[PDB]
Design a protein around this motif. Structure first.
Motif, PDB file in Angstrom:
ATOM      1  N   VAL C  33      70.639 -41.164  56.291  1.00 34.33           N
ATOM      2  CA  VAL C  33      71.549 -40.556  55.327  1.00 34.33           C
ATOM      3  C   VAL C  33      72.909 -40.302  55.961  1.00 34.33           C
ATOM      4  CG1 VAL C  33      71.916 -38.556  53.868  1.00 34.33           C
ATOM      5  CG2 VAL C  33      69.671 -39.585  53.996  1.00 34.33           C
ATOM      6  N   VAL C  34      72.923 -39.834  57.208  1.00 31.40           N
ATOM      7  CA  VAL C  34      74.186 -39.544  57.880  1.00 31.40           C
ATOM      8  C   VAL C  34      75.006 -40.814  58.062  1.00 31.40           C
ATOM      9  CG1 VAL C  34      75.209 -38.672  59.989  1.00 31.40           C
ATOM     10  CG2 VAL C  34      73.286 -37.496  58.982  1.00 31.40           C
ATOM     11  N   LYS C  35      74.358 -41.912  58.453  1.00 35.03           N
ATOM     12  CA  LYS C  35      75.077 -43.170  58.616  1.00 35.03           C
ATOM     13  C   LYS C  35      75.694 -43.627  57.304  1.00 35.03           C
ATOM     14  CE  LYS C  35      73.534 -44.092  62.902  1.00 35.03           C
ATOM     15  NZ  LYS C  35      74.751 -44.664  63.528  1.00 35.03           N
ATOM     16  N   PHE C  36      74.966 -43.467  56.199  1.00 32.33           N
ATOM     17  CA  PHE C  36      75.494 -43.863  54.899  1.00 32.33           C
ATOM     18  C   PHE C  36      76.736 -43.060  54.541  1.00 32.33           C
ATOM     19  CE2 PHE C  36      74.127 -46.333  51.162  1.00 32.33           C
ATOM     20  CZ  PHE C  36      75.092 -45.938  50.271  1.00 32.33           C
ATOM     21  N   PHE C 100      81.850 -51.285  47.220  1.00 33.40           N
ATOM     22  CA  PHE C 100      81.187 -51.775  48.417  1.00 33.40           C
ATOM     23  C   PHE C 100      79.680 -51.764  48.234  1.00 33.40           C
ATOM     24  CE2 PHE C 100      85.192 -50.004  49.804  1.00 33.40           C
ATOM     25  CZ  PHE C 100      85.700 -51.019  50.574  1.00 33.40           C
ATOM     26  N   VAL C 101      79.015 -52.658  48.956  1.00 31.08           N
ATOM     27  CA  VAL C 101      77.565 -52.673  49.089  1.00 31.08           C
ATOM     28  C   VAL C 101      77.243 -52.391  50.547  1.00 31.08           C
ATOM     29  CG1 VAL C 101      75.489 -54.064  48.952  1.00 31.08           C
ATOM     30  CG2 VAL C 101      77.190 -54.230  47.171  1.00 31.08           C
ATOM     31  N   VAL C 102      76.327 -51.461  50.786  1.00 29.75           N
ATOM     32  CA  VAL C 102      75.964 -51.044  52.134  1.00 29.75           C
ATOM     33  C   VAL C 102      74.677 -51.747  52.536  1.00 29.75           C
ATOM     34  CG1 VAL C 102      75.462 -49.102  53.626  1.00 29.75           C
ATOM     35  CG2 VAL C 102      77.079 -48.844  51.773  1.00 29.75           C
ATOM     36  N   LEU C 103      74.647 -52.277  53.754  1.00 34.28           N
ATOM     37  CA  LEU C 103      73.489 -52.986  54.270  1.00 34.28           C
ATOM     38  C   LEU C 103      73.074 -52.400  55.608  1.00 34.28           C
ATOM     39  CD1 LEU C 103      75.535 -55.624  53.142  1.00 34.28           C
ATOM     40  CD2 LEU C 103      73.232 -56.536  53.175  1.00 34.28           C
ATOM     41  N   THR C 104      71.805 -52.593  55.945  1.00 35.02           N
ATOM     42  CA  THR C 104      71.293 -52.309  57.277  1.00 35.02           C
ATOM     43  C   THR C 104      71.007 -53.636  57.965  1.00 35.02           C
ATOM     44  OG1 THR C 104      69.413 -51.419  58.509  1.00 35.02           O
ATOM     45  CG2 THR C 104      69.063 -51.931  56.188  1.00 35.02           C
ATOM     46  N   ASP C 111      79.186 -51.865  55.559  1.00 31.29           N
ATOM     47  CA  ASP C 111      79.445 -52.371  54.223  1.00 31.29           C
ATOM     48  C   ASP C 111      79.463 -53.896  54.227  1.00 31.29           C
ATOM     49  OD1 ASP C 111      82.469 -53.326  54.349  1.00 31.29           O
ATOM     50  OD2 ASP C 111      82.342 -51.412  55.405  1.00 31.29           O
ATOM     51  N   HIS C 112      79.397 -54.478  53.029  1.00 34.15           N
ATOM     52  CA  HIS C 112      79.235 -55.924  52.925  1.00 34.15           C
ATOM     53  C   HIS C 112      80.469 -56.675  53.396  1.00 34.15           C
ATOM     54  CE1 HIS C 112      81.723 -55.424  49.396  1.00 34.15           C
ATOM     55  NE2 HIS C 112      81.719 -56.725  49.175  1.00 34.15           N
ATOM     56  N   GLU C 113      81.647 -56.063  53.301  1.00 34.98           N
ATOM     57  CA  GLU C 113      82.855 -56.755  53.732  1.00 34.98           C
ATOM     58  C   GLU C 113      82.874 -56.943  55.240  1.00 34.98           C
ATOM     59  OE1 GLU C 113      86.499 -55.047  51.904  1.00 34.98           O
ATOM     60  OE2 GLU C 113      85.738 -56.202  50.200  1.00 34.98           O
ATOM     61  N   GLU C 114      82.473 -55.919  55.989  1.00 34.50           N
ATOM     62  CA  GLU C 114      82.423 -56.050  57.438  1.00 34.50           C
ATOM     63  C   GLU C 114      81.293 -56.971  57.874  1.00 34.50           C
ATOM     64  OE1 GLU C 114      81.998 -52.362  59.423  1.00 34.50           O
ATOM     65  OE2 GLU C 114      81.571 -53.264  61.377  1.00 34.50           O
ATOM     66  N   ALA C 115      80.152 -56.911  57.188  1.00 32.52           N
ATOM     67  CA  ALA C 115      79.019 -57.746  57.569  1.00 32.52           C
ATOM     68  C   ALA C 115      79.351 -59.223  57.433  1.00 32.52           C
ATOM     69  CB  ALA C 115      77.798 -57.393  56.725  1.00 32.52           C
ATOM     70  N   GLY C 121      73.258 -61.133  58.168  1.00 32.23           N
ATOM     71  CA  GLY C 121      72.564 -60.676  56.987  1.00 32.23           C
ATOM     72  C   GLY C 121      71.808 -59.388  57.247  1.00 32.23           C
ATOM     73  N   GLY C 122      70.978 -59.018  56.281  1.00 34.91           N
ATOM     74  CA  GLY C 122      70.207 -57.793  56.425  1.00 34.91           C
ATOM     75  C   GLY C 122      69.532 -57.400  55.134  1.00 34.91           C
ATOM     76  N   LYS C 123      69.294 -56.101  54.996  1.00 36.28           N
ATOM     77  CA  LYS C 123      68.632 -55.538  53.831  1.00 36.28           C
ATOM     78  C   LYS C 123      69.580 -54.600  53.101  1.00 36.28           C
ATOM     79  CE  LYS C 123      64.135 -55.770  56.047  1.00 36.28           C
ATOM     80  NZ  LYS C 123      63.368 -56.475  54.997  1.00 36.28           N
ATOM     81  N   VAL C 124      69.528 -54.634  51.776  1.00 40.04           N
ATOM     82  CA  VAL C 124      70.425 -53.836  50.950  1.00 40.04           C
ATOM     83  C   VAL C 124      69.927 -52.399  50.904  1.00 40.04           C
ATOM     84  CG1 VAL C 124      71.476 -53.612  48.697  1.00 40.04           C
ATOM     85  CG2 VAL C 124      70.990 -55.860  49.606  1.00 40.04           C
ATOM     86  N   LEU C 125      70.841 -51.450  51.098  1.00 38.92           N
ATOM     87  CA  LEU C 125      70.536 -50.030  50.992  1.00 38.92           C
ATOM     88  C   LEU C 125      71.058 -49.415  49.700  1.00 38.92           C
ATOM     89  CD1 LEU C 125      71.170 -48.630  54.578  1.00 38.92           C
ATOM     90  CD2 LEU C 125      68.995 -49.051  53.470  1.00 38.92           C
ATOM     91  N   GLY C 126      72.332 -49.602  49.399  1.00 36.86           N
ATOM     92  CA  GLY C 126      72.897 -49.000  48.216  1.00 36.86           C
ATOM     93  C   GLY C 126      74.304 -49.478  47.963  1.00 36.86           C
ATOM     94  N   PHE C 127      75.030 -48.702  47.166  1.00 40.55           N
ATOM     95  CA  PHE C 127      76.384 -49.056  46.775  1.00 40.55           C
ATOM     96  C   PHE C 127      77.156 -47.784  46.473  1.00 40.55           C
ATOM     97  CE2 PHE C 127      75.900 -48.110  42.332  1.00 40.55           C
ATOM     98  CZ  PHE C 127      74.555 -48.269  42.119  1.00 40.55           C
ATOM     99  N   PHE C 128      78.475 -47.920  46.398  1.00 42.49           N
ATOM    100  CA  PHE C 128      79.326 -46.832  45.946  1.00 42.49           C
ATOM    101  C   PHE C 128      80.662 -47.404  45.506  1.00 42.49           C
ATOM    102  CE2 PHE C 128      82.185 -46.613  49.561  1.00 42.49           C
ATOM    103  CZ  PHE C 128      81.445 -47.191  50.559  1.00 42.49           C
TER     104      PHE C 128
END
Ligand SMILES: [Mg+2]
Ligand SMILES: [Mg+2]
Ligand SMILES: [Mg+2]
Ligand SMILES: [Mg+2]
Ligand SMILES: [Mg+2]
Lengths: 199, 38, 129, 143, 93
Positions: C33-36, C100-104, C111-115, C121-128
RNA sequence: UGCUGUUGCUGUUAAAGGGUUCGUAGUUGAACUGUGGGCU
RNA sequence: CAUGGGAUAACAAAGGAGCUUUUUAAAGGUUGGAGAUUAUGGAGCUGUGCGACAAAUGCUUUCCCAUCUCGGUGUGGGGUUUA
């Protein structure tokens, strides 16, 4: 000379100028002080290190001792600390036990076998408790600013503000020299309801 | 056979522990003597 | 029972923003949660926040500026290759200009732009947004 | 008692303090605390009862904060732990008393319903204790 | 019941003997500390046991169950009519 | 044709929550071991 | 199929009282090559002593057996050890 027995056997050969001065004080106290005379005979230190805190007059003396004597030192820490100060004017003394840290493994199976008291999180917490021992921690918070930094603050009881107020600048700097982590302090009157005290 | 092997290992371990403790206790008696030999 | 700590936290933040509150309390806390929150904080969508320790799963108090419209979690955490970024942007984002879409990923949480720039690639966590 | 097997939603419980250091006025050595724990066990007390005696009349709020180890750990080191775990012991005792009552009052259908819930609780608990090897395999509950 | 709690303490810590014949032997000697009799006992056998206890001044307890209950309360899988505890360990009675 | 619905349906009254509990496969499952530091 | 990465996860194990290192000394138990016989030694096996250093938890231990005002510190006052 008998006073060298208060050092580790490795350093009995060529002690540094700080080591034997502390050794003489410990040896003299072991036969004079009323309460120290039955704990000191079993005690001996590892090394002594000198730290100069910037923007300050007083200097800090750090004393390292083996982890075996943790309960021994905690029993007489108040008397031992004050006694050493008188022999060494213009200096502050802290007693720190020497602990080792096992680096965090990458493999899951190895991570399950780590002794939890040897993790860096547990070790750094105990080092902080050594520097303020008569007082204890009543709260802890982390502040995450927008620039991305994270600052840790530790709250102490306001009942003993008078004793430990002068030493907080020295404690904060020495804590950074041993752990390379930043700490900040505050006081709480009535920690049960999380009430901080401003002056 | 398996039980006998396990029992032998247990006996050896206990003997080693006792010997180490005895050697440790014998040591530091010399150090105590030197304290009285100052 | 509570199955997902991350989903619980994000729903609490979105609800407070919709009602226009200035602060919101979150419990239980987690390192995920803190990382998000730091990802959202870096792009300016939330203000300062603070972690309180209680010898258990802690609590977080976060300050909200008025800039956040919605945040949410994606469950289950689907896998996303580098070629699937356009698909996820097209489906859960308001536009191609913001959000943005946040990934692990094995490189961390981002976020997806930096990735995409790091080609991972990775797994989707959420968005904002 | 609250959630499993029923509609209760109570919240009553104790809240341990943040500061884990014993008070200054407590002047009992750790060795003597361990002696009192083992002494009460031979008298016949269960771990839950031992901790309440020290709390009520000796000033010892938490044994772990004074000695570093929990009460049941102390008994295991001294060979005084109960044959079966304490909570499983009390559930078996309750089911035995229910069954004895039911063999005379054969139409007490409310008690029969409660007996089903208690025995389901026993089987769930036994399964957990066998997995962590606190019970022998093939341990079985007999009605 | 309070009597059952003490029997478990004796059964694991003290020393005891089960059966009428062995209990009488302990009463002829001086080792008996307490005798427990089930309510399902033949009247002539009970009167003989109680007479021995009176002569030797041994405390005697009348159990509230039958010989089936007394055997179960001791952890056994058989019936016992008379119990005699020669050694009491860590127990009041 | 979002009238087969993974993306993406409906179930108070339009069609549709089992009379109530227990329960085995199955699906789902709380936190924690981690801020590297110093130089221009 | 090979290989780089370790954040999110899965499998397996465990249920926490089945849980020192080193240095000296002593005691026993390849001969020209090929084929036999024997002995002296390495190395490891135990049990004696010896030197040196550690230890994450005090053997100048525990246990019952008994028998009998000054100094340093912060602002003339405060707080610390001691008397
Ligand atoms: Mg369509
Ligand atoms: Mg429809
Ligand atoms: Mg209808
Ligand atoms: Mg219904
Ligand atoms: Mg989890």
């Amino acid at each position: 000379q008998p006073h060298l027995r208060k050092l580790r056997k490795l350093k009995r050969g060529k002690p540094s100028d700080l080591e034997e001065s502390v050794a003489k004080a410990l040896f003299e106290l072991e036969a004079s002080h009323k309460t120290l005379r039955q704990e000191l005979p079993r005690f001996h230190v590892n090394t002594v290190r000198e730290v100069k805190v910037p923007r300050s007059k007083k200097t800090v003396l750090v004393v390292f001792y083996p982890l075996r004597f943790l309960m021994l030192v905690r029993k007489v820490q108040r008397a031992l600390t004050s006694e050493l100060e008188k022999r060494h004017p213009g200096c502050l003394v802290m007693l720190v036990a020497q602990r080792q840290i096992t680096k965090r493994p990458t493999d899951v199976y190895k991570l399950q076998k780590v002794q939890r008291s040897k993790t860096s999180t547990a070790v750094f917490e105990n080092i902080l408790n050594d520097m303020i021992y008569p007082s204890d921690v009543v709260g802890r918070r982390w502040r995450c600013r927008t620039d991305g930094s994270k600052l840790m603050k530790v709250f102490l009881d306001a009942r003993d503000r008078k004793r430990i107020e002068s030493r907080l600048r020295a404690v904060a700097y020495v804590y950074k020299q041993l752990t390379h982590r930043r700490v900040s302090f505050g006081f709480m009157w009535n920690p049960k309801l999380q009430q901080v005290s401003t002056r | 056979q398996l039980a006998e092997q396990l029992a032998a290992k247990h006996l050896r371990d206990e003997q080693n522990r006792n010997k180490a403790r005895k050697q440790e206790l014998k040591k530091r008696e010399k150090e105590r003597e030197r304290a009285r030999r100052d | 029972t509570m199955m997902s700590v991350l989903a619980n936290a994000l729903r609490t933040i979105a609800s407070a923003e919709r009602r226009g509150k200035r602060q919101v309390l979150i419990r239980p806390s987690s390192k995920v949660v803190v990382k998000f929150l730091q990802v959202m904080q870096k792009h300016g969508y939330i203000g300062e926040f603070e972690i309180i320790d209680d010898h258990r799963a802690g609590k977080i108090v976060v300050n909200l500026n008025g800039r956040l419209n919605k945040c949410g979690a994606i469950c289950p955490r689907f896998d996303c290759a580098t070629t699937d970024y356009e698909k996820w942007m097209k489906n859960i984002l308001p536009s191609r200009q913001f959000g943005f879409v946040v990934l692990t990923t094995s490189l961390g949480i981002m976020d997806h732009e930096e990735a995409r720039s790091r080609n991972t690639g990775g797994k989707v966590l959420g968005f904002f947004y | 008692m609250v959630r499993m097997h029923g509609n209760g939603r109570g919240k009553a419980s104790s809240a341990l303090p943040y500061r884990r250091t014993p008070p200054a006025w407590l002047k009992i050595a750790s060795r003597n605390v361990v002696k009192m724990v083992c002494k009460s066990s031979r008298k016949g007390m269960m771990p839950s009862q031992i901790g309440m005696e020290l709390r009520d009349s000796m000033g010892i709020a938490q044994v772990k904060n004074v000695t570093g180890r929990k009460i049941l750990r102390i008994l295991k080191h001294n060979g005084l732990a109960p044959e079966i775990p304490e909570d499983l012991y009390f559930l078996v005792k309750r089911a035995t008393q229910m069954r004895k009552h039911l063999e005379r009052h054969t139409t007490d259908r409310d008690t029969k319903y409660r007996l089903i819930l208690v025995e389901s609780r026993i089987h769930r608990l036994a399964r957990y204790y066998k997995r962590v090897k606190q019970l022998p395999p093939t341990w079985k509950y007999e009605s | 019941d309070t009597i059952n709690a003490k029997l478990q303490l004796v059964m694991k810590s003290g020393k005891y003997v089960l059966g009428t014949q062995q209990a009488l032997t302990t009463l002829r000697q001086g080792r008996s500390k307490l005798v427990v009799i089930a309510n399902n006992c033949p009247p002539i056998r009970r009167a003989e046991v109680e007479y021995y206890c009176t002569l030797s001044k041994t405390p005697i307890h009348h159990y509230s169950g039958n010989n089936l209950d007394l055997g179960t309360a001791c952890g056994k899988h058989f019936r016992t009519c008379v119990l005699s505890v020669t050694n009491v360990g860590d127990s009041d009675i």
